[PDB]
């Protein structure tokens, strides 16, 4: 009865927040659908215009961001409820191997100087895997020729350091580095989701000067005790 | 053992809400960029081709979306905190301060507030801050829109509490009786807005309705279920 009342109250709060997001999406998509209908009618008729193609593609990009809001929000629930103990080397082995392949295809190099060990972590494996994958792919794009990935552990947590030889980053640019949600280079995700996912696992992220000349991204995650 | 597990639930759900609030704030900020590119494309098209019913329509839809994004940005900046913790509370203790502050506000405005049917010690279960702000918002709206007076009535039965807020204002047209609760509604502050009032009431398994008031203006009805031990 009371355990049941607590479970019902928690779900009721979660569902009402999801209904509000969903209702915000329905309102935004009312003018967007009218706009997409107007565009389609014009495009079907006066069909060869760079401006009309631009309006359609931007309307679709706006629509994808709204879809991201709904998908990524229902998914942040999954990270909260779906958690397990995992070892750092088993968690990120595939990401580091796929990144080494991506580096090779690009004509760049990835060096894992300090490899991960069987260090226990607690959280959502998919979210922690994609957070490192995102920063590593960011280094693969920004780097001139090389990227380096280092793992360190102490009694309290795991430090992941991602370095690149990309252009020197200004302290101002470094301070706002985790602010963009989308990649400026739908749209691919920027580094805001990385900070979000890491803070959700009670860790932190920092942007610093890299010894290789480019950007240094530092992830800290607590050890599972 | 069970406490540690239950507290691990609540704190994980608290971290989830922090990340969902950040996500809403982030995406709200990103929406403007394709919209301005779309508005530039529309402005250019109007120069190249002439006046068009379709182009004029795209333009009025892009402006409506711009207003909604402005409103979504303000909504994303004023998100509520500690929304998870629930407790048993009595209706009179919950809303006493709101009704007293409203009586003072009415006096300052040169208007009158009458609580004809006062709240009793009726048990509710949920978030006090959300339930308090929900009534505060509808009462502060009645104060703002009323011509001279507002009335607040509380009724209880075996299943729930009915709160009726009346004003002698211009009211709300039948066409917008449900529309005023939609995010970003505008006719074209007193609080977080009517969409956030309906969310707070529906999370407590209640409902809100807009009706004709015997006072001539708007009647807002809130229904909330009783907490049953
Ligand atoms: N008591 C009322 N009388 C008349 N109109 C009302 C009343 N309460 C709300 N409304 C209408 O509903 C709209 C949405 O309400 P609300 O979200 O609380 O305020 P806001 O104007 O800040 O968006 C108001 O702008 C107004 O047009
Ligand atoms: Mg108002």
Q: Two tokens at B135?
A: 């009534």
Detail the residues of B annotated as belonging to a binding site: 29-32, 140-145, 167, 186-187, 189-194
* Radius of gyration of the CA atoms of chain B, in A: 22
- What are the angstrom distances between the C-alpha of A189 and each of A52, A133, A205? 26, 11, 16
Q: How many Cα atoms occupy the beta-carbon half-sphere of A156 within 13 Å?
A: 3
Asked if A165 and A144 touch (Cβ cutoff 8 Å), the reply is yes
Q: Cite the DSSP H helix spans in chain A.
A: 2-45, 50-81, 88-106, 125-142, 171-175, 192-200
Within 10 Å of residue B110's Cβ, how many Cβ atoms? 7
Q: What is the domain count for chain B?
A: 2
- Looking at the structure, tell me whether residues A163 and A55 fall in a common domain: no
Q: What is the phi-psi region of residue B171: left when phi exceeds 0, alpha when psi lies from -120 to 50, beta otherwise?
A: left
**Total residue length of chain A:** 225
- Please list, in sequence order, all residues whose beta carbon lies within 8 angstroms of the beta carbon of residue A5, skipping any fewer than 6 positions away: B125
Asked if A122 and A188 touch (Cβ cutoff 8 Å), the reply is no
Q: Two tokens at B126?
A: 């949920």
B chain contacts of residue A81, beta-carbon cutoff 8 Å = 12
**Total residue length of chain B:** 229
Query: Which residue in A35, A76, A196 is closest to B61 by CB distance?
Result: A35
Asked if A129 and A90 touch (Cβ cutoff 8 Å), the reply is no
- Looking at the structure, tell me whether residues A213 and A104 fall in a common domain: yes
Residue with tokens 């995992």: A86
Domain range spanning residue B164? 84-229
From the list A187, A179, A178, the residue with the least C-alpha distance to A66 is: A187
Asked if A162 and A151 touch (Cβ cutoff 8 Å), the reply is no
Where would I find the beta strands (DSSP E) of B69-206? 87-90, 112-117, 123-126, 149-156, 160-167
Q: Is B160's C-beta closer than 6 angstroms to any atom of ligand 1? A: no
CB-defined contacts A:B, below 8 A: 155
Classify each residue of A48-84 as buried b or exposed e, where b means 16 or more C-beta atoms within 10 Å of its C-beta. Answer: ebebbebbbebbebbbebbebbeebbebbbebbeebe
Angle at A199 between CA A195 and CA A201, to 5 degrees: 125
B179 interface with A at CB cutoff 8 Å? no
Strand, coil or helix: what is A147?
strand
Asked if A99 and A132 touch (Cβ cutoff 8 Å), the reply is no
Distance CA B20, CA B126 (A): 21
* Radius of gyration of the CA atoms of chain A, in A: 21
Domain of B49, CATH number, reads: 1.10.287.130
Residue with tokens 């947590």: A157
Q: Is B145's C-beta closer than 6 angstroms to any atom of ligand 1? A: yes
Phi, psi of B90 (to 5 degrees): -95, 135
Report how far apart the first and last C-alpha atoms of chain B are (Å, whole number): 24
Asked if A197 and A78 touch (Cβ cutoff 8 Å), the reply is no
From the list A109, A106, A128, the residue with the least C-alpha distance to A119 is: A128
Q: How many Cα atoms occupy the beta-carbon half-sphere of A202 within 13 Å?
A: 14
Strands A146-153 and A157-164: antiparallel
- What are the angstrom distances between the C-alpha of A69 and each of A77, A110, A130, A198? 13, 33, 17, 18
Q: Is B167's C-beta closer than 6 angstroms to any atom of ligand 1? A: yes
Distance CA B136, CA B110 (A): 19
- Looking at the structure, tell me whether residues B156 and B131 fall in a common domain: yes
Distance CA A132, CA A198 (A): 10
- What are the angstrom distances between the C-alpha of B114 and each of A90, B82, B210? 67, 32, 19
Detail the residues of A annotated as belonging to a binding site for ATP: 26-29, 137-142, 164, 183-184, 186-191
Within 10 Å of residue B23's Cβ, how many Cβ atoms? 22
- Looking at the structure, tell me whether residues A54 and A105 fall in a common domain: no
Q: Two tokens at B21?
A: 């609030």
Among B83, B108, B132, give the residue marking a domain's end: B83
- Looking at the structure, tell me whether residues A64 and A95 fall in a common domain: no
Asked if A69 and B27 touch (Cβ cutoff 8 Å), the reply is yes
- Looking at the structure, tell me whether residues B70 and B174 fall in a common domain: no
* Chain B residues 64-103 with CB within 8 Å of chain A: 64-65, 68-69, 72, 75, 83-84, 86
- Looking at the structure, tell me whether residues A132 and A221 fall in a common domain: yes
Where would I find the beta strands (DSSP E) of B63-175? 87-90, 112-117, 123-126, 149-156, 160-167
Breakpoints of chain A, after residues (C–N > 2.5 Å):
185
Q: Which of the 8 DSSP states describes residue B192?
A: S
Domain of B172, CATH number, reads: 3.30.565.10
Q: In what order do the strands lie in the sheet with B149-156?
A: B112-117, B149-156, B160-167, B218-225, B207-212
Beta bridge pairs of residue B222: B163, B208
Strand, coil or helix: what is A224?
coil
Among B43, B65, B83, give the residue marking a domain's end: B83
- Looking at the structure, tell me whether residues B72 and B117 fall in a common domain: no
Distance CA A132, CA B200 (A): 37
- Looking at the structure, tell me whether residues A151 and A54 fall in a common domain: no
Q: Which of the 8 DSSP states describes residue B227?
A: P
Distance CA B4, CA B21 (A): 26
Indicate the Cα dihedral angle A183, A189, A193, A194, nearest 10°: -80
Q: Is the dihedral of CA A64, A65, A68, A69 positive or negative?
A: negative
Query: From the alpha carbon of B193, which atom of ligand 1 is closest?
Result: 17
Distance CA A32, CA B62 (A): 8
Asked if B95 and B119 touch (Cβ cutoff 8 Å), the reply is yes
- Looking at the structure, tell me whether residues B70 and B115 fall in a common domain: no
- Looking at the structure, tell me whether residues B113 and B44 fall in a common domain: no
Among B35, B67, B83, give the residue marking a domain's end: B83
Distance CA A49, CA A224 (A): 57
- Looking at the structure, tell me whether residues A57 and A142 fall in a common domain: no
Beta bridge pairs of residue A157: A222
Q: Which of the 8 DSSP states describes residue B64?
A: H
- Please list, in sequence order, all residues whose beta carbon lies within 8 angstroms of the beta carbon of residue B164, skipping any fewer than 6 positions away: B151, B152, B153, B154, B155, B219, B220, B221, B222
Beta bridge pairs of residue B149: B112
- Please list, in sequence order, all residues whose beta carbon lies within 8 angstroms of the beta carbon of residue B86, skipping any fewer than 6 positions away: A6, A9, A10, A13, B125, B126, B127
């Amino acid at each position: 009865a009371s355990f049941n009342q607590v479970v019902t109250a928690l779900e009721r709060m979660m569902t009402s927040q999801q209904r509000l997001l969903s209702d915000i999406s329905h309102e935004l998509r009312t003018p967007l659908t009218r706009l997409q209908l107007g565009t389609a009618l014009l495009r079907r008729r006066s069909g060869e215009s760079k401006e009309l193609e631009r309006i359609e593609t931007e309307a679709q990009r706006l629509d994808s961001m709204i879809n991201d809001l709904l998908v990524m929000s229902r998914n942040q629930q999954k990270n909260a409820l779906v958690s397990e103990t995992i070892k750092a080397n088993q968690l990120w082995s595939e990401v580091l191997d796929n990144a080494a392949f991506e580096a090779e295809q690009m004509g760049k190099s990835l060096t894992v100087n300090f490899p991960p060990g069987p260090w226990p972590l607690y959280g959502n494996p998919n979210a922690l895997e994609s957070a490192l994958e995102n920063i590593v792919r960011n280094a693969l794009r920004y780097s001139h020729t090389k990227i380096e990935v280092g793992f360190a552990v102490d009694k309290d947590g795991i430090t992941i350091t991602v370095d690149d030889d990309g252009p020197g980053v200004s302290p101002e640019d470094r301070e706002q580095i985790f602010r963009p949600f989308y990649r400026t280079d739908g749209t691919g995700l920027g580094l805001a989701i990385v900070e979000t996912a890491i803070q959700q696992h009670r860790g932190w992220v920092k942007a610093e000067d890299s010894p290789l000349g480019g950007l240094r991204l530092v992830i800290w995650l607590p050890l599972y005790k």
